[PDB]
Design a protein around this nucleic acid. Structure first.
Lengths: 67, 68
DNA sequence: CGGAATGTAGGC
DNA sequence: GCCTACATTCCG
């Protein structure tokens, strides 16, 4: 389920992956993919790769949408 | 981190206070308790739910570990 | 997936 | 406006 994320620049994808077991069973992890295919696991990490090129202040990392 | 015995609780219960290093609440602290087996507790009701009627926590000050 | 580290809603 | 209590992130 690597789906296009319309809130980021073209080529950027989003994946949500369900945790299958343990204490956090049924919660999920959200990942982003740049055009090259770099995997990003957090909003600060994403903000660092992009820097001043994209304003992520309103960006909701979990849903992939601007608030 | 230092785990301090909490004399006010039953034998073996310990307390730790951790300073937040960054973010909005930087400089504030969080207090945690540990059972003698080492399970971590983060609030007074969590601690009350675990101990049940073995201890009365009505007067227990979570922050300081002191009965008031 | 865990869990230290931090965010944050709602009671006060 | 601040704190309690618990929700959630973020990196290992």
């Amino acid at each position: 389920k690597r789906m296009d994320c319309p809130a980021l620049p073209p080529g950027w994808k989003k994946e949500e992956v369900i945790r299958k077991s343990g204490l956090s069973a049924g919660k999920s992890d959200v990942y982003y993919f740049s055009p090259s295919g770099k995997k990003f696991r957090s909003k600060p990490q994403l903000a660092r790769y992009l820097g001043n090129t994209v304003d992520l202040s309103s960006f909701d990392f979990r849903t992939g949408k601007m608030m």
